[PDB]
């Protein structure tokens, strides 16, 4: 039993605060974009031949064109303005915990896992240190993961052969914190 | 190089006769409009204290999406959508400590059409205590995303599966979690 999907997006892309703004009104059928309005172009353009009838018809309606030429201001910049306070400026601290992946004796290889969870926004740096010196090799990362609820998590692992006396530090820099957070694991 | 993106995403699907209207900020959902109750649903409740939205405008948009669908189905000669089945991930939202409350997250990704049946299984039995879910979320490539949530109490004694049905899958997909 065949399915047929009609999909549309209206997109506001923001650069350098709201100094540059790009607005798109995009029309899709069954995963195929076929006609769109790009604010950098100023009229509708067919993305595929299946959208040619719409780009020609829409572009002949002059009040529609000027309506869509103002969206950058009265839709993009307006909506950024009224949601900026709880989205663009949302800051939630990461919780950092360090733990070995397996309980191992010393002088055997092991993955040292730095868990960073609950944080917003998504941009973050996680570094690994051994006795104060930064480990640039041996680092494995799951990447940034959306939890779907306005928080992120990530797992950053260090390939080690722990020896007694060694100090490993997981350091996290995020916009929500002034000072980098650091968690230690002692061998 | 862009700092942020706000996306107003909507669809209407036949023959399910099912629609969606939602807003997306940098991949997270600000809100959507419940098609049954015709009202704005904020993804975090604090959002409803900082902002408003007229749900009737979303509904008027869905009416055009519907009209556009019948027009575009005829114009394409009734070519059906190609099913793309999802990849499913299960993870917890914090590091697991035995006997301390936590949340299982079933992340359903890179699929179209935006229809799934999703079931949480605890030791093979369905569970609905405290489950929540998101609507279908947009992707740059125009496949869809969806999250399902299960509060639970970690224990050496239980095992969990997120079970996903989708028309591009020959059989239901189970994605397993245990301590």
């Amino acid at each position: 039993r065949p399915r047929f999907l009609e999909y549309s997006t209206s997109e506001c892309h923001f650069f350098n605060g709201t100094e540059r703004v790009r607005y798109l009104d995009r029309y899709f059928h069954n995963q195929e974009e076929n006609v769109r309005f790009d604010s950098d172009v100023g009229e509708f353009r067919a993305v595929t031949e299946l959208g040619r009838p719409d780009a020609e018809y829409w572009n002949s309606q002059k009040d529609l064109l000027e309506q869509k030429r103002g969206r950058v201001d009265n839709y993009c910049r307006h909506n950024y303005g009224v949601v900026e306070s709880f989205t663009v400026q949302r800051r939630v601290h990461p919780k950092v915990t360090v733990y070995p992946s397996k309980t191992q004796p010393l002088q055997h290889h092991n993955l040292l896992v730095c868990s960073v969870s609950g944080f917003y926004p998504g941009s973050i740096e996680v570094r690994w240190f051994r006795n104060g010196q930064e480990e640039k090799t041996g680092v494995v990362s799951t990447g940034l993961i959306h939890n779907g609820d306005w928080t992120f998590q990530t797992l950053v692992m260090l390939e080690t052969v722990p020896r007694s006396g060694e100090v490993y530090t997981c350091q996290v820099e995020h916009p929500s914190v002034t000072s980098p957070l650091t968690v230690e694991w002692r061998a | 190089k862009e700092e942020h993106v706000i996306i107003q995403a909507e669809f209407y699907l036949n023959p399910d006769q099912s629609g969606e209207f939602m807003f997306d900020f940098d991949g997270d959902e600000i809100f959507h409009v419940d098609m049954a109750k015709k009202e704005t649903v904020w993804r975090l409740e604090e959002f409803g204290r900082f902002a408003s939205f007229e749900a009737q405008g979303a509904l008027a948009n869905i009416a055009v999406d519907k009209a556009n669908l019948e027009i575009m189905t005829k114009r394409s000669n009734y070519t059906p959508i190609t099913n793309v089945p999802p990849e499913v991930t299960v993870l917890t939202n914090s590091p697991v400590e035995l006997r301390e409350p936590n949340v299982l997250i079933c992340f359903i990704d890179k699929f179209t059409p935006p229809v799934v049946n999703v079931t949480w299984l605890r030791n093979g039995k369905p569970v609905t205590t405290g489950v929540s879910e998101t609507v279908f979320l947009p992707r740059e490539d125009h496949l869809f995303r969806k999250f399902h949530y299960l509060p639970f109490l970690p224990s050496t004694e239980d095992v969990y599966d997120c079970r996903v049905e989708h028309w591009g899958l020959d059989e239901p997909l189970l994605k397993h979690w245990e301590f």
């Binding site: 549309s8 209206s10 009104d25 029309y27 009838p53 719409d54 020609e56 018809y57 829409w58 529609l64 309506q67 969206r71 009265n74 839709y75 307006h78 909506n79 009224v82 949601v83 | 107003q8 909507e10 807003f23 600000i30 902002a51 408003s52 939205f53 007229e54 405008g57 979303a58 948009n61 055009v64 999406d65 009209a67 556009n68 027009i71 575009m72």
Partner: peptide, 13 residues
């Protein structure tokens, strides 16, 4: 103030 929606254009039939 209101979060506003963008209007969807009807296609040519």
């Amino acid at each position: 103030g209101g979060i506003g929606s963008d209007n969807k254009v009807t296609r040519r039939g």
